[PDB]
């Protein structure tokens, strides 16, 4: 098994790691804020989803300090993880096309 | 089972405080969040803060006057309200009541029936 | 803070007929509502949850619908057992909020 492929299944676990602390955090942050939507489990997991991806619907999102603090960090996480993932491909078609090249 | 059990009545000399309790059995989650809901007589149902367990975070009702601070016990599956400078308007039955995180109140103590007076 | 309006206060039916209480709110809150039971001396309890959802353990009997602002808790052919005060709960933005409930009367 080599390493970018090692490194896109790690980088997956982590992100639904991310998801769900992420959920679980950003509830715990944005109760208390009057008018905010992001506080029960369910949706706040549907919202670390479409945040991660980068989507962003506006359906839901967070107004707290510290809700917006967990926000970045699953922003980053599933850009991150994404990227990770592209870069893997990447690594895949090089390798594939010096074989296909002989050298 | 009785998943949230809470005394009957607490009688409190004016301007004192007392703690209520409210001991969970059942499920327990680390998401689970303990409410609590004060009724005056003949007055409907008023919700004045929530506490999670797992985390010891607390959040009050800011519409009406802050006597109240919640506190829970890990340990003994216990969730205290300490409420303090009472006066008559603060004589009700306040109930707790389970959340798990997904917006209802599944589950709801008997309720404690709090008399402030000499 | 989503106010929650419970209008009539007091709603009067015959035995075995049909009757509807209403909930409204300040702003439109999805089907983030559920509807609670009290009787004389009682403590609430869950009947329905997000505006529609059947609990187990309480009679087909009762029902719920509605979403946006406009919410309506039915029951086809009260019976005795139902006279309690019933309340409306919100749980789309907080803090959760409570309505004024209403009585039924037979």
């Known amino acids: 098994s080599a390493l970018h492929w090692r490194a896109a299944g790690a980088a997956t676990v982590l992100l639904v790691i991310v998801l769900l602390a992420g959920s679980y955090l950003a509830v715990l942050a944005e109760r208390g804020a009057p008018g905010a939507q992001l506080i029960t489990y369910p949706r706040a997991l549907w919202w670390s989803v479409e945040t991660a991806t980068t989507v962003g619907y506006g359906d839901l999102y967070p107004v707290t300090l510290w809700g917006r603090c967990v926000a970045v960090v699953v922003m980053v996480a599933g850009i991150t993880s994404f990227g990770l993932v592209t870069a893997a491909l990447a690594t895949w078609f090089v390798g594939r096309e010096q074989e296909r090249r002989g050298h | 089972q009785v998943q949230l059990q809470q005394p009957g009545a607490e009688l409190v000399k004016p301007g004192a405080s007392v703690k209520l309790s409210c001991k969970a059995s059942?499920?327990?989650?680390?998401?689970?969040?303990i409410h609590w809901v004060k009724q005056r007589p003949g007055h409907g149902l008023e919700w004045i803060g929530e506490?999670?367990?797992?985390?010891?975070?607390?959040n009050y009702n800011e519409k009406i006057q802050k006597k109240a601070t919640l506190t829970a016990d890990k340990s003994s599956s216990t969730a205290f309200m300490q409420l303090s400078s009472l006066t008559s308007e603060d004589s009700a039955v306040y109930y707790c009541?389970?959340?798990?995180?997904?917006?209802?109140?599944?589950?709801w103590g008997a309720g404690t029936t709090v008399t402030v007076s000499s | 803070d989503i106010l929650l309006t419970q209008s009539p206060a007091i709603l009067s039916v015959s035995p075995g007929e049909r009757v509807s209480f209403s909930c409204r709110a300040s702003?439109?809150?999805?089907?983030?509502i559920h509807w609670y039971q009290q009787r004389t001396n009682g403590s609430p309890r869950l009947l329905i949850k997000?505006?529609?959802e059947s609990i187990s353990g309480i009679p087909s009997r009762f029902s719920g619908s509605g979403s946006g602002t406009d919410f309506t808790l039915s029951i086809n052919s009260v019976e005795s057992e139902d006279i309690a005060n019933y309340y409306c709960?919100?749980?789309?933005?907080?803090?959760?909020?409570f309505g004024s409930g209403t009585k039924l009367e037979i």
């Open positions: 009541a389970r959340e798990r995180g997904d917006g209802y109140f599944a589950v």
């Open positions: 059942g499920y327990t989650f680390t998401s689970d969040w």
């Open positions: 506490i999670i367990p797992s985390y010891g975070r607390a």
């Open positions: 702003q439109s809150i999805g089907t983030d």
């Open positions: 997000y505006a529609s």
């Open positions: 709960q919100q749980s789309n933005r907080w803090p959760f909020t």
